[PDB]
């Protein structure tokens, strides 16, 4: 299962000037491209090394798609102002996300496409990819307009054929990086609180993909601290799970780690 | 509405020309096309909310822009003979409309690229009285009008009966004739018929007037020649009834 | 890229007509325009969904489940349907407001003529001169009149007028020259006319 996903953001800038259009492309958990119009030379650029040698024809197409979106979104921002009876005074945010997922057979599983205005759901392409639903009741005009002009058909074709054709082109392009599994380098650490208490921390570090599960047992559900999965900065990810353990009786707590790159799910305990 | 200026334009080879378009109020998109003698609508350039959106093989010497007030300008220079065509402007993209992508055109700009501006000639209008052999046979009377020796075919023929324009019984030629067929920059001829009842023609209180509106040279245009300046002018030919 | 068929159509008044349109790539919306000579193309029919058929008066267009074809039908032809019929489309995957045009289909409707009483008349000028015109008139729909066989001779194609009050339509062609060698009987000779054609003095 792989996914080609894209994140588009346009923010209106009263006083500052034209709005800010940012496009962020992802192959699974890897960012590979970006377009930012805040820059004076706005072009779709590589953000992964397996894109560093691609050719003008590609960058040209992608800059145009992004440029033409920025153009529409700039208008959409003034249209959305009218729907919501808003003024030229405030800065508002239009967000568009689209993506396709592969099945286990390497064939199209699902496709999604949505719009949001000011962080709240706006319009959504249905699971069938044949119509649009106004999630917000202000999105009702956009919904009739887009269903009546048969817009979904353009997206159904992208999500079902283009997105998938390309997801494979990219997956091959960076086989050595993307498909390679980096399993987490684990270790448990001991940080004493008081004479009575002590904190036992399980560390999952340098893992790709970002999907992981970290659990403490004796099942010990009752008050375990778990931090959000964070990026290391080099492409890999980090995660830790902590539990309040009574002094001396440390070994009574076991850490369970489950990641894709691991043949056997690893279980840990602290070594003094 | 889609308003285009100038409606007509006659200029010399090498000279620059500028064409204006005012889109439909609310419409955010402007398209420029050029329709040649037989050729369909060959696309030139497209604008969206002041910015360029699409280019469709403009001659480099062709130039365009859309202003913040969504008006547009089509610059053509250095002008060449073959650039003679109808330049249409199209408007769309009003987000208010349900069917945004529906295109609306204006009554174009006719551009006549000529070598010598002294080849420009207004028409000679002449109305012909009905045959008394037709009046006896049919009991109807056909008036015939001719607009001859005009270059280019920038004309408009209209009939006027007793002061007001008529359309019933009227019949202008859809296309003009070349007076010198095997000749480039051949002057044109145009015929138009007006058929009335014998008893309408036979009344001398009835005034019939053929009227040709020629579109010619600008006032800023340089007229070196000794003959009259072939400007934009109405050339009429009248007739009264007779028993 | 679109392809309109046939390039030109010559229909008789009252007859029905069909027009074809085809793309090389898959399309998603179809637009049908009429263009009266020298005027801007004007929208006739918009089609948005596959297999949809929508009409506007006697005009009727179809989407085509193929997503690569569209047809326009004029039900009963009236002579005013003369003009170019342009087919335009929204290519699937094309960015917003991208839409291709066809090169058009030329339609020619031939008016029905009721009482053909053929004749060639001579008309007098409002200035007392030899300079005058010849008028071929009141002829049927089948007369395929030919151009001036001479240098100094000029002949126009059939034009049809309607005296809608008296409800009478008539065909007419004008002929003129400068020569003394210019007579009514000699005017239309290359143009095949009937044996039963009126000629006064």
């Amino acid at each position: 299962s792989h996914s080609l996903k894209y994140f588009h953001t346009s923010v209106s800038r009263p006083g500052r000037g034209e709005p800010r259009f940012i496009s962020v492309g992802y192959v699974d958990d890897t960012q590979f491209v970006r377009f930012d119009n805040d820059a004076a030379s706005p072009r779709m650029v590589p953000r992964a090394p397996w894109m560093e040698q691609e050719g003008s024809e590609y960058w040209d197409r992608e800059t145009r798609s992004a440029r033409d979106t920025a153009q529409i979104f700039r208008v959409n921002l003034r249209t959305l102002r009218g729907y919501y009876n808003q003024s030229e005074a405030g800065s508002h945010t239009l967000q568009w996300m689209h993506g396709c997922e592969l099945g286990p057979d390497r064939r199209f599983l699902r496709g999604y496409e949505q719009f949001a205005y000011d962080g709240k759901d706006y319009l959504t392409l249905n699971e069938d990819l044949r119509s649009w639903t106004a999630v917000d009741t202000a999105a009702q005009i956009s919904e009739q307009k887009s269903n009546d002009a048969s817009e979904a058909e353009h997206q159904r074709a992208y999500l079902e054929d283009t997105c998938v054709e390309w997801l494979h082109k990219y997956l091959e392009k960076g086989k050595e990086t993307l498909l390679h599994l980096e399993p987490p380098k684990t270790h448990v650490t001991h940080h004493p609180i008081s004479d009575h208490e002590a904190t036992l921390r399980c560390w999952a570090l340098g893992f790709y993909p970002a999907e992981i599960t970290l659990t403490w047992q004796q099942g010990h559900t009752q008050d375990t601290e778990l931090v959000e999965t964070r990026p290391a900065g080099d492409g890999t990810f980090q995660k830790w799970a902590a539990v309040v353990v009574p002094s001396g009786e440390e070994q009574r707590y076991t850490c369970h780690v489950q990641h894709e790159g691991l043949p056997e799910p690893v279980t840990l305990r602290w070594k003094p | 509405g889609v308003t285009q200026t100038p409606k007509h334009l006659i200029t010399a080879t090498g000279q620059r020309v500028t064409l204006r378009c005012s889109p439909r109020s609310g419409d955010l998109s402007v398209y420029w096309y050029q329709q040649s003698l037989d050729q369909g609508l060959q696309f030139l350039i497209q604008y969206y909310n002041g910015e360029e959106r699409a280019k469709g093989n403009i001659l480099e010497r062709f130039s365009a822009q859309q202003f913040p007030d969504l008006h547009s300008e089509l610059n053509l220079s250095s002008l060449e003979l073959g650039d003679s065509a109808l330049y249409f402007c199209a408007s769309s993209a009003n987000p208010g409309d349900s069917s945004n992508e529906k295109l609306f055109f204006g009554s174009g700009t006719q551009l006549s690229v000529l070598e010598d501006l002294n080849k420009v000639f207004p028409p000679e209008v002449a109305v012909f009285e009905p045959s008394e052999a037709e009046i006896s046979h049919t009991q109807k009377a056909t008036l015939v009008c001719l607009a001859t020796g005009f270059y280019p075919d920038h004309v408009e023929l209209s009939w006027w009966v007793n002061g007001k324009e008529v359309h019933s019984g009227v019949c202008t030629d859809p296309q003009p004739l070349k007076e010198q067929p095997a000749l480039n920059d051949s002057r044109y001829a145009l015929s138009s018929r007006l058929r009335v009842s014998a008893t309408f023609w036979q009344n001398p209180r009835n005034h019939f007037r053929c009227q040709v509106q020629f579109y010619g040279l600008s006032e800023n245009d340089e007229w070196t020649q000794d003959r009259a300046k072939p400007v934009t002018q109405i050339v009429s030919a009248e007739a009264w009834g007779r028993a | 890229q679109l392809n309109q068929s046939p390039q030109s159509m010559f229909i008789q008044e009252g007859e029905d007509v069909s027009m074809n349109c085809t793309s090389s790539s898959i399309f998603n919306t179809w637009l049908w325009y009429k263009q009266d000579p020298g005027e801007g193309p004007v929208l006739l029919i918009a089609l948005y969904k596959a297999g949809e058929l929508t009409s506007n008066g006697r005009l009727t267009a179809q989407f085509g489940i193929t997503r690569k074809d569209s047809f326009l039908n004029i039900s009963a032809s009236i002579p005013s349907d003369v003009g170019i019929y342009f087919c335009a489309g929204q290519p699937l995957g094309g960015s917003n407001y991208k839409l291709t045009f066809g090169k058009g289909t030329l339609l020619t409707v031939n008016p029905n003529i009721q009482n053909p009483d053929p004749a060639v008349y001579q008309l007098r000028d409002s200035k007392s001169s030899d300079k005058s015109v010849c008028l071929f008139t009141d002829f049927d729909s089948q007369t395929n009149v030919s151009q001036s066989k001479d240098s100094d001779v000029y002949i126009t194609d059939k034009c049809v007028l309607d005296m809608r009050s008296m409800d009478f339509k008539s065909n007419s062609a004008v002929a003129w020259s400068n020569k003394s060698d210019f007579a009514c009987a000699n005017a239309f000779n290359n143009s095949i006319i009937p044996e039963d054609t009126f000629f006064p003095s």
Partner: peptide, 9 residues
């Protein structure tokens, strides 16, 4: 590649 066409809301 990103979606070549968006929506005019």
């Amino acid at each position: 590649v990103m979606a070549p066409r968006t929506l005019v809301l």
